[PDB]
Amino acid sequence: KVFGRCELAAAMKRHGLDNYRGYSLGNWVCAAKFESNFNTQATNRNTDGSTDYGILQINSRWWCNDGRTPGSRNLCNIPCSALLSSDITASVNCAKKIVSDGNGMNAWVAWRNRCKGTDVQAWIRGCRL
Numbered sequence: 001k002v003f004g005r006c007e008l009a010a011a012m013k014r015h016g017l018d019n020y021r022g023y024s025l026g027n028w029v030c031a032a033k034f035e036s037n038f039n040t041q042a043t044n045r046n047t048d049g050s051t052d053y054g055i056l057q058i059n060s061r062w063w064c065n066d067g068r069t070p071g072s073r074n075l076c077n078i079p080c081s082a083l084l085s086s087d088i089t090a091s092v093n094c095a096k097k098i099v100s101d102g103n104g105m106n107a108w109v110a111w112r113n114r115c116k117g118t119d120v121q122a123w124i125r126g127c128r129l
């Protein structure tokens, strides 16, 4: 599913992501824009052989099982395919565990490089929330 901007904002809010671990809703929207272009089916293979999945490009090295990433973990206890569903619940639940892991949103390289420090508020401007 390709979400619209304000549509994803409202789904993330409904799922408890606004100010989760202190990160305002715009940070989460901005990270999804640059990690997946708001597409839940986005997948990208990494050089180490792991793959990133879904709207927040969660990686199989640590967070989900895809059966093809040696020596990896599945800390969110889910098949990586769950992260590609039109329902964002699994991506949100897993992202809450990631962002509570110590490094905050820095776990998402695109957030650090394209959202951190910017006017993220712009991402939810105009939206009914």
Ligand SMILES: [Cl-]
Pocket: 065, 066, 067, 068, 069, 070, 071, 072
């Ligand atoms: Cl695996």
Ligand SMILES: [Cl-]
Pocket: 021, 022, 103, 104, 105
């Ligand atoms: Cl933090």
Ligand code: NA
Pocket: 060, 061, 062, 063, 064, 065, 066, 069, 072, 073, 074
């Ligand atoms: Na894994």
